[PDB]
């Protein structure tokens, strides 16, 4: 049969450079949330190890239609005909150490938004800089405020700024929220989270259950 080889993909893009070994439960929950929020057609998981095959991708992510590749930023265009050439200046790296905060007018300046697929540590190990130094002529950096976010929070904030055109200063965050389940067990999450319409921090589905 010849009809299922169709390049239907042709009919803002988010790129996560996977920088973890394998897929921990937390990574799977975060990536799942990202897929649900930006859509499988608008997300690329890149830079997976060269030995990566479909059996190495978690079934929770494949079920959501994850588009993934072992190519890095410079090779992605070979793999997806639908991805506009990643070109110098039009690719934004979201970087906690950028000088300039992302603003809605940056929607006119960039076509691709790149994030480290990193489970951040505290203190940060500044691994996102690796990305900036790996592609010195491709990427232009933008910040999302002065506090570390998880990958799914950073993508959610970027979508609020770029698609919904909301200024960074207008986004309601909660910094380092505590989740207490009894008078003796509590967990403070050392990241900045977006607040939902109900005043609660937005976490990936199942994250709360995992923390407890």
Ligand X SMILES: Nc1ncnc2c1ncn2[C@@H]1O[C@H](CSCC[C@H](N)C(=O)O)[C@@H](O)[C@H]1O
List of residues contacting ligand X (CB under 6 A): 94-96, 115-116, 118, 120-121, 124-128, 143-145, 148-149, 151, 154
CA dist., res. 25 & res. 210, Å (int): 9
Burial class (CB in 10 A: 0-12, 13-18, 19+), 205: exposed
Taking the least distance from each CB to ligand X, the nearer of 69 and 157 is: 157
Q: How far is the CB of 20 from ligand X (least distance, A)?
A: 10
How is the beta sheet containing 13-18 ordered, strand by strand?
43-46, 13-18, 112-117, 91-94, 139-142
DSSP 169: G
Check residue 47 and give left, alpha or beta (phi > 0: left; psi -120 to 50: alpha): left
Judged by CB, which is closer to ligand X: 96, or 201?
96
The number of angstroms, rounded, from the C-alpha of 88 to the middle of its chain's C-alpha atoms is 20
With CB atoms as reference, the residue minimizing the distance to ligand X is 116
Report the Cα–Cα distance between both ends of the chain, in Å, rounded: 49
Name the residue nearer to ligand X (CB basis): 44 or 181. Answer: 44
Q: How far is the CB of 66 from ligand X (least distance, A)?
A: 18
Q: Which helix (H) or strand (E) holds 155?
A: helix 151-162
Min separation Cβ 158 and ligand X, Å: 8
* Closer Cβ to ligand X, 144 or 160, answer by number: 144
Nearest-10 crossing angle of helices 151-162, 25-38: 10
Kindly state the smallest distance separating residue 141's Cβ from ligand X, in Å. Answer: 8
Residue (116 or 201) nearer to ligand X, CB: 116
Q: Which is nearer to ligand X, 171 or 208 (CB)?
A: 171
Q: At its nearest, how many Å lie between ligand X and the CB of residue 178?
A: 20
- The two three-digit tokens of residue 188, written as one number: 């403070």
Shortest CB 94 distance to ligand X, Å:
4
């Amino acid at each position: 049969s010849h009809h299922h080889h169709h390049h239907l993909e042709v009919l803002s893009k988010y790129i996560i450079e996977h920088m973890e070994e394998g897929f921990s439960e937390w990574v799977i929950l975060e990536y799942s949330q990202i897929l649900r929020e930006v859509g499988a057609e608008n997300l690329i998981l890149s830079s997976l190890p060269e030995s990566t095959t479909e059996k190495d991708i978690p079934q929770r992510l494949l079920k959501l239609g994850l588009r993934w590749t072992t190519k890095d930023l410079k090779g992605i265009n070979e793999d997806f005909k639908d991805l506009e050439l990643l070109k110098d200046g039009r690719v934004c790296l979201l970087d906690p150490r950028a000088t300039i905060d992302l603003q809605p007018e940056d929607a006119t300046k960039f076509d691709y938004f790149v994030f480290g697929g990193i489970l951040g540590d505290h203190p940060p190990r500044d691994r996102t800089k690796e990305l900036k130094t790996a592609y010195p002529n491709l990427l232009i950096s933008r910040r999302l405020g002065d506090k570390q976010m998880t990958t799914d929070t950073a993508i959610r904030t970027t979508q609020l700024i770029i698609k919904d055109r909301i200024a960074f200063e207008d986004i309601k965050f909660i910094d380092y929220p505590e989740f207490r389940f009894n008078k003796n067990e509590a967990t403070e999450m050392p990241f900045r989270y977006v607040l939902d319409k109900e005043g609660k921090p937005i976490l990936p589905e199942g994250m709360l259950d995992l923390i407890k």
